[PDB]
Every structure is written in C-alpha cells, then in structure tokens.
Design a protein around this nucleic acid. Structure first.
Ligand code: ZN
Lengths: 170, 126, 101, 209, 57
RNA sequence: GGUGAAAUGCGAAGACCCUGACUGGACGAGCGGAAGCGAAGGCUGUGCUCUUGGACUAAUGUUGCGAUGAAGGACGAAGGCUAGAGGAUCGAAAUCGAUUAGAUACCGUUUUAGUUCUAGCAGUAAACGAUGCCGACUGGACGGGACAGUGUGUGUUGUCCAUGAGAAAUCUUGAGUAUGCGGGUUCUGGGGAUAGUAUGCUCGCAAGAGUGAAACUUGAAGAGAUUGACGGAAGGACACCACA
C-alpha cells in the first residue's frame, strides 16, 4: 500500500516546494486496529531488514498482531514528477541545482512511501523549502502555527496561506 | 416475524456476508470484509469479519428483518473445502446485535469426479 | 528401511493415483497419509449465546466428517507425522469397528 | 475501502411483499415472504413465476424426529397478494447423509424413473447399508458382488409398485412416512441384513401440474 | 453482582503461564462452572462476576 | 483474485456474490482395505450382450501325449510421430511481473504444442520383490479370500516368533535341507575408468532401438555395519547473563 504527501493552501508568488526526506509520523497496526503510542522518525539513510531479509528503512514489531512492520521511502523517479530545474549564481557557471514537483490539483507532491503491515494516519512536522517565482530560494522557511509562511526577496512577498500536510493513499 | 437467509462464504481470503430473500433471488444487504481494511493481507482475518458483520447488522435491522437461517460454505470443488478463520466471528457478531436463529446447514460444493488442478506432478515447490 | 517399502500394496501391479490436498502433487492412493475427523459446525465458545437466540424449543447443532489426503513432504512438514526410532517404527494403530458406542 | 477515494467510476421502499403458501397436505401452510421489484406500471409478474424455495419437514408438520428431510417447491401461480407452490423435489440434509456411510461396510444404491397420473416424470434415488448381527467378531461386513445385484433388483420393484401412476397428492404422503424405505428393509434383508434404508433424493424431469 | 467460590485449581494455561483455569461454584444457585482468572488465586477464594454464562472448556 | 508480502493483469458497456434456464468436453469422489482379478503392461457409475480364467467337487474319457528352451512369433506404462475428428481443465516452449550481487530458475500473469477419441507406427522405464523355470522334503502362533464338508480338508495369501542360513542388514513355501560339496535344464558376471562410446550389420517416416570394441590411462572403485563430528534436523527438560 503506497501513500503520498501533499502541501495544500493558496499560493502567492510560489514556484515549487520540497521536503528534505526526514520526518516524524504516527502509525497503526493493521489486523489489530491498535495504534502506536509514539511518533517514529522515518529517515532515508536508515537501514533495516524484513522477514525475508529485504532492506527497508524502519522495522517495528506489532505488539498485538505479533508480526513485523516495515516502511520505506521512494524517490519520485525523475522523468514524470520532479522535472529538473536550475537557479542563478555568480558570473561563471555555478547554476545551483533543485528538483521541483508540479502543481496538478492545487497542491504539490513531495514524498512517497511504501508500507507493509503498518498504516500511516498523520504526519507531524517537516523541513520546508520555498522557491520564488523567479530565482531566489528560501531554505528552512519557518512556517507559523497559524499556517502562513512568508519571506521577502528584499522587496516582494512570497507566502503560503492555509498551510497543512496530508497523507493520501495512492 | 420476518425471516431471511445469510449466505456466508469464508475462505483463507476475504469472508462474505450476503443476506437475501427466502427464495434467494432478491438481495437485502451485501458487505464483504475486504472493503473494511486497506491491506490485501488482512481481507480474510477475524477482525475484518467483525467490522463487516456490524454494518450488515445495523442496516437490515432497520429494514425489518428479525430472524436468520444460515448457509455456510468453504470453497469446495478442487479448492480446499473447510471453513476459514473469519467464519465463526461473523455469526457470533450477528447473534449479539439482536437477531434470532433458525436452521443451520453446510452447503459447500462437492466434486464427485473432479477436474485436474494447479501444480503439476511435483506440486507447488515453495 | 521398511518391509512395506513405504506403502500398503500387495499382489497387484498398479493402484491408482490422487492429487495432494495442499500442494497438488500426484501420488499413489495406497502411499498417501489419510486422516478422518468430525467437527462441530458451530464453535464451542459460542454455545451459550446460541441457546438464547434459537426460536425452536429443541435444537441440535450439526456435525460433519472430513477425509484428508497429503503427500510425504506435506505431512512431515506440517507435523501430521513424525520421525520415530528404529523399533517404534513398527507400531500400527487402528479403530476397532466392534466397539460398543 | 481498499481503493483510493476516486479512481474507478430509496429504491427499497418502493418494493412489494408477498406470501408463500405450500400445499395443504401439511398443517403449516404459510412459510415466509418474498420481495418483488416493481419494474413497470402494471408489471407483469411472470418474473416471479419459476422461483424455488425449500422448507424443513419439521416445520411443515410440527414434529422433531423428522427434521432430517426437506421439500422443495416451485412457484406456479399468483392469487391476489399470495403465491402458490408445487411439489418439486426432496432431499436429506448434508450432515445426516454423511453419517450413514461407514468404514468396513458395503453401500448399495439404485435409481429409477416413475410417471405420475397427470404425466409428470420423476427420478428417485434409494440407498442402503449392511448390518452386523448381535455376535459379530470380524473386522469387515461385506456382501458378495452377485448378491448386491439381487438386492438392487428388489429395489427396482419396490420403487415402481408404490410410486407409479398415482396422484401427486399422495406421492408426498408416502415420501413423508418412509413407506419405500421400510419395504426395502424386509424384502431385502432376506438376502442380507440391512440398515438405514431410505429414499435419498427426488428430481423433477418434466412436470405438467 | 454475582459471586462464587473457587474450589478446584485445574491448571495454569496461558500464553506465557499468565492465566489459570479454575472451577467456580456459584452461590445464589449452586452450579459448578469452569472459568479463567488472571490474578494469584488460591482455594477457598471468592471471586466476583458480572455475568455467569460461559465455561471456556 | 492470489501471495511470505506484492506487482503486472480483470472490474460502472455492472465484475465478485445469490438465483431461473441451457450448451460442451473431461472425469467416475465418499464406500476403498497390507481385499479381488489378469501372462505382464494394467483394471472401480448402472443395465444388456459376445467372450475369459483359476480353484473346488466326483466309481466320467483317454493312456505318458511330458520338463527346459539359441533360432522364430505375438503382446507391451508415459512421452514422441503419421492421418482424420474434438477441445472443458491443466500446461513444456515463448512472454512479461517480482525476488537476487546475477538468476535464461523456484513464485506469479498472458498465451501454445500436447493432455481426449478412431486407425496405425514405435519398442523404451527404479517395465522392482532391484529376487530363472520345473521337481522332493521340512516347527509354532494369530488372520484373510474361494469352494466343499461338518467340528475338518484342498488351492492361494498377510503379520509375528524359533531352528537353520548369512559378510552383515536381514530371510521363514526360502536368502533353509553342511566344503558332510552331483535332482532335470537355461541365461548372465570375471578390478576401475575409456564406454553402452567408435565401426560394421539388421529394423524404423523420423526421434532412435538391437547387437557391440580397441589404443591410451589407473591403485583402488564398491557392500554392510561401528564410534565420533556436523545438520539453514525433530523432541523432552531447564535458566531474571530467557521471557511473563
Ligand atoms: Zn503436498
């Protein structure tokens, strides 16, 4: 069962968004219904092993159902989702590198997960990154608790209102 | 009162809970555990058979049905013919919602001279 | 190993074959492992709730009989049959059809 | 909900309820209701003719020691707000049928056709098992092959001098009292003692009614 | 609620030796009954119930 | 739906599930067993018909007409091949999806020859009890199947114990009856490997079958049993450097 992470709200002078692939969430055991009482962190450099010995990111043993549960991150293959871009620099060819998804239905795709035996029901936080409409990049944009990010490129305002993160089955 | 029949198919995957007429030609409710979970591995477990026999309970219990005659089955034929795990936990969940019980029977299909089935001369080597 | 040579066949050439109930492999009928069981149609941890639900004044819960048939690999793996020692290999168990009840 | 929300693309109140009524031979004539989807105005209810239902013989005639037998009826007429059934078959329940076959015994079976008085044709299947006498000490109880061919000839004659040209109202009277299973067990037990002799099933091949 | 006094200790059969089978004897109307408990029970003890309709074995 | 878990693939032109009618090929469950029959290969629905076997029972006929058997002849699982008919299920080859360091494999999806019948060719199997045929003689115990008798007999056959035999495992109408060595009559073997390979010949539509060497190489290859070591072997006990 595959999941998708999205960013919602109304966007003003934004061109792209991207998380850094490391964030906490909350899971719950299928065949049980009982939820995990903590928030686990799912990075992309972690290592694990399932029942057949495959290489996954995280591994938890469901207490009630009494089996193993695995999660792992996919990468959003570069031919249809990420659409390589560039950005400005000094006079010789630096041209800073970035990948940015597409705004299909008034939201951006940022990550993709594959799950066995567990099930994600929420996500707590992340590390946000903003790309101006022309060329300037804001890193680690401190979003409000009131869900409005805002930064200024020395004159103008790029901002996002009604900010939230979701998890939809794919 | 008013009586209906409950056809309950239960195998290693995906129990069924299907309620019909006395003739059997008119359906009153049909909910399969398997449209209660999101993992394909657990379509046929006893927790998903309890989530399925509770929706069927509240619905037909307002549509006027009071009594139930049962008809159980496995998969029969050239397939394994014995009731699965989520069989007994859908019956016990309807008996508690308030319904009464009539006759009980087992109606699995019996091959009296079958056809050949999968695997070969050596079987499925896993 | 055995004086059977592993199967109950005497004074005939061929003896008919069957397909195993778990993997589906082809085996002689005299060599397969066969088991018979009578199970109640309703679970035993559910009889109390069924005595208040019944509408008839007298009810008998049904029972069915089942014959099973497996191959040597599938019965050994499933622990239907186990490895025995050299002398205990010779002990056969039966049914006695002349028992009183 | 296994699928994502959208990927792949009250009528019950406007229905009808009828009443099923069985033949008047049995005391309990009323056996339940049956729905009907009102397809059209002045809906031809010939879509409700042909349906088929069964009832346990312990419910037609309130009695408990005969609850191992069933009767099967077929709808053939509508009178106002009420349906009528006709005799269509008979069978044993699968749990009682299984309990008569025994390891180390012989099983004899026959079958035969009969013709009723109006021309309806029925097939009849019969059954029997061998019996041990009160001082038995062997392991098997088997009849010789040439003597199963003699008991089978007897089973063909009992079937066709009772169930023959005769009304259908009484063919349902001697299928309920076990008249055929009791003649088989005395004419046939003079070749070998038998037990569990019964009619196993009845089919309708071609009815008139 | 109801009551009952344990009078026989059949055995300890749990997943990891946690539960213990027992044979109670209801008191408002005498009836032996099997039942599984969870704590450290002895003989002569009187347990509570809130419904007496199961036997477990 | 199926899986250790999934993916390809099927589903709003309504699948899956429940019901009324039909069509088609294949198969003959349970009863079904250390039970029967056939030269062997093999043979389980019911009723008719043409053919067949061994045993038993007897004051029938005949009168040695017999045992073995290079050369010759007929039959012979499954797969394959040649013609016609047929087409449910399963499925080599091909093909994608997984798994993997890699898998042209195990597991799965799409889809074939074949799998069935009639008429033939072919001639092989761990075609095995890995156990020529005929004749004489030999202790017990518990059984089965057929016939005849009346407290038993003849032909067959399963299990278990001695005597005897054997390198031992084991054998019990024989693997017994003395190296104390001869009842009649055949076949096959003569250290391993080269090799059931070359060549000639006979048979076959073919695929192949039958018969069948040498040069050169080499000190062991093999049978049955004993004590150890090991097993991604099975059990029974145990332990807050194990769990609850
Ligand atoms: Zn198997």
């Amino acid at each position: 069962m595959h999941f998708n992470i999205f960013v919602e709200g109304e966007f003003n002078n934004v061109k792209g968004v991207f998380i850094d692939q490391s964030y906490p969430l909350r899971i719950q055991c299928t065949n049980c219904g009982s939820p995990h009482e903590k928030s686990v962190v799912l990075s992309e450099d972690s290592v694990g092993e399932g029942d057949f010995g495959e290489k996954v990111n995280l591994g938890i043993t469901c207490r009630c159902c009494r089996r193993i549960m695995t999660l792992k991150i996919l990468k959003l293959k570069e031919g249809r989702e990420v659409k390589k871009h560039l950005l400005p620099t000094n006079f010789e060819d630096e041209f800073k590198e970035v990948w940015l998804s597409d705004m299909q239905k008034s939201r951006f795709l940022v990550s993709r997960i594959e799950t066995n035996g567990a099930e994600v029901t929420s996500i707590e936080s992340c590390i946000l990154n903003l790309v101006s409409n022309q060329d300037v990049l804001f890193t680690n944009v401190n979003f409000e608790d009131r869900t409005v990010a805002k930064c200024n490129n020395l004159n103008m305002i790029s901002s996002i209102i009604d900010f939230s993160l979701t998890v939809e089955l794919a | 009162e008013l009586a209906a029949v409950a056809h309950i198919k239960a195998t290693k995957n995906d129990t069924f809970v299907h309620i019909t007429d006395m003739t059997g030609s008119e359906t009153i409710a049909k909910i399969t555990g398997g449209m209660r979970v999101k993992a394909q591995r657990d379509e046929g477990s006893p927790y998903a058979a309890m989530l399925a026999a509770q929706d069927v309970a509240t619905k037909i219990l307002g549509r006027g049905v009071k009594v139930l005659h049962f008809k159980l089955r496995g998969a029969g034929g050239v397939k394994p013919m014995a009731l699965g795990p989520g069989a007994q936990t859908a019956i016990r969940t309807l008996i508690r919602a308030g319904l009464r019980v009539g006759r009980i029977e087992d109606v699995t299909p019996v091959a009296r001279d079958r056809v050949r089935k999968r695997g070969g001369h050596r079987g499925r080597r896993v | 190993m055995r004086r059977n040579h592993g199967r109950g066949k005497k004074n005939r050439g061929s003896a008919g074959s069957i397909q195993c109930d778990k993997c589906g492999s082809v085996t002689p009928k005299d060599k397969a492992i066969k088991r018979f069981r009578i199970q109640s149609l309703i679970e035993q941890a559910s009889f109390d709730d069924l005595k208040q639900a019944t509408i008839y004044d007298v009810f008998e819960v049904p029972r069915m009989g089942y014959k099973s048939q497996f191959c040597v690999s599938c019965a050994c793996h499933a622990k239907i049959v186990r490895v025995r020692s050299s002398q205990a290999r010779k002990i056969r168990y039966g049914f006695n059809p002349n028992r009183v009840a | 909900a296994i699928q994502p929300p959208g990927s792949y693309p009250n009528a019950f109140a406007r229905k009808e309820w009828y009443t099923l009524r069985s033949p008047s031979i049995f005391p309990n004539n009323i056996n339940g209701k049956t729905l009907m989807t009102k397809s059209a105005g002045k809906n031809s209810y010939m879509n409700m003719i042909g349906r088929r239902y069964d009832v346990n013989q312990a419910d037609l005639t309130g009695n408990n020691d005969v609850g191992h037998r069933k009767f099967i009826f077929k709808i053939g007429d509508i009178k106002g707000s009420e349906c009528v059934g006709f005799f269509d078959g008979m069978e044993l329940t699968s749990d009682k049928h299984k309990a008569m076959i025994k390891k180390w015994h012989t099983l004899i079976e026959a079958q035969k056709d009969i013709v009723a008085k109006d021309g309806s044709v029925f097939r009849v299947f019969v059954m029997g098992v061998t019996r041990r006498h009160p001082g038995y000490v062997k392991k098997t109880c088997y009849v010789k092959h040439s003597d199963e061919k003699k008991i089978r000839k007897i089973m063909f004659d009992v079937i066709e001098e009772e169930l023959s040209g005769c009304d259908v109202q009484k063919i349902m009277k001697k299928l309920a009292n076990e008249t055929v299973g009791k003649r088989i067990e005395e004419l046939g037990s003079e070749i070998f003692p038998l037990q569990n002799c019964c009619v196993r099933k009845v089919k309708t091949i071609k009815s008139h009614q | 609620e109801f009551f009952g006094e344990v009078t026989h200790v059949l055995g300890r059969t749990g997943g990891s030796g946690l539960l213990t089978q027992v044979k109670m004897e209801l008191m408002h109307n005498k009836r032996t009954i099997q039942r599984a408990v969870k704590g450290p029970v002895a003989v002569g003890d009187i347990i509570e119930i809130l419904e007496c309709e199961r036997e477990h074995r």
